[PDB]
């Protein structure tokens, strides 16, 4: 036996020595040394110092620059707001609880910190899916006589909120649950216990298919069609040097967006697929915290790829940061 069960938790450490305590009451210094909790707190501090100003500046430059308030940029602001939910709804809480050694807010705070951390991560995920759909509709033009206006961009933002609520709310009403994970300092979806009272198996499968396989197919198709349209348009217009330059730049960005999406969610998909399959094994709390390293850091490198690498946002950010004149 490799774990210790409880009414609302699961500590990945056998209680054969009698040292295991509830992650809501006592520190968990038997599954990880205190310095490992300080390093957990140190990395959370890194994500806050780098994630907040980069995502807040994105919302700030949009207020000061009229040319940034276009409908195609609505989903990029939704990405920045989603990353802010990951910072204050999860990163700040994990920094606080890690310094105590356990989740000090109890089961109620576990559902709150779990709902907001899952919501912010899923809004950002579906924002990258809607962004790929919008860019596929605008560039490839598969719809005869279609203009992407403001009403379509609002539906694209509302679609991300519905898909995220259809993913973070079921654990609050009986489909799966939120429990502390890894070092028992942050709460998330349960995929390490086969908890039959909440049907954790049907939820992990529904999550793997609807909220990972479907987004992965849509992104590959939309961006695949976009690279095909751009490459064939440049092939019929090789006398234009800027069209040949745009074809290479667009192709390079699609590779970056696709690879960054895989680095973000594939480690979370593979490890959680192994933890749920080969269940009950001696899963180390360090082993638990390596899909979270890639997914939580997306609050930093998604604005770098989708905002700072955008020519309009980068110019407005340099202007705002350089006192208004550059």
């Amino acid at each position: 036996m490799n774990g210790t069960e409880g009414p609302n938790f699961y500590v990945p450490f056998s209680n054969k020595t009698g040292v295991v305590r509830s992650p809501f009451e006592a520190p968990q210094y038997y599954l990880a040394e205190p310095w490992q909790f300080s390093m957990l707190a140190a990395y959370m501090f890194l994500l806050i110092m780098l994630g907040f100003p980069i995502n807040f500046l994105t919302l700030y430059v949009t207020v000061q620059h009229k040319k940034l308030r276009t409908p195609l940029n609505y989903i990029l602001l939704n990405l920045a707001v989603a990353d802010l939910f990951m910072v204050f709804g999860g990163f700040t809480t994990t920094l606080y609880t890690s310094l105590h050694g356990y989740f000090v807010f109890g089961p109620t705070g576990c559902n709150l910190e779990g709902f907001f951390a899952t919501l912010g991560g899923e809004i950002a995920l579906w924002s990258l899916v809607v962004l790929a759909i919008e860019r596929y509709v605008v560039v490839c033009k598969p719809m005869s006589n279609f203009r992407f206006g403001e009403n379509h961009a609002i539906m694209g933002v509302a679609f991300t909120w519905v898909m995220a609520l259809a993913c973070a709310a079921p654990p609050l009403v009986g489909w799966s649950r939120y429990i502390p994970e890894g070092m028992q300092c942050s709460c998330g979806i349960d995929y390490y216990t086969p908890h039959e009272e909440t049907n954790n198996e049907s939820f992990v499968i529904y999550m793997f298919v609807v909220h990972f396989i479907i987004p992965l197919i849509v992104i590959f198709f939309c961006y695949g069609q976009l690279v095909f349209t751009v490459k064939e348009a440049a092939a019929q217009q090789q006398e234009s040097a800027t069209t040949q330059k745009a074809e290479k730049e667009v192709t390079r960005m699609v590779i970056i967006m696709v690879i960054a999406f895989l680095i973000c969610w594939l480690p979370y998909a593979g490890v959680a697929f192994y933890i749920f399959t080969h269940q009950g094994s001696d899963f180390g709390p360090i082993f638990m915290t390596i899909p979270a390293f890639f997914a939580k850091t997306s609050a930093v490198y998604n604005p770098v790829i989708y905002i700072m690498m955008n020519k309009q946002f980068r110019n407005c950010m340099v202007t705002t940061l350089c006192c208004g004149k550059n």
């Binding site: 276009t70 605008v138 560039v139 745009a246």
Partner: peptide
């Protein structure tokens, strides 16, 4: 498509 690529922020 150069104008659509600028609207979507890809070029």
């Amino acid at each position: 498509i150069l104008e659509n690529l600028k609207d979507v922020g890809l070029f």
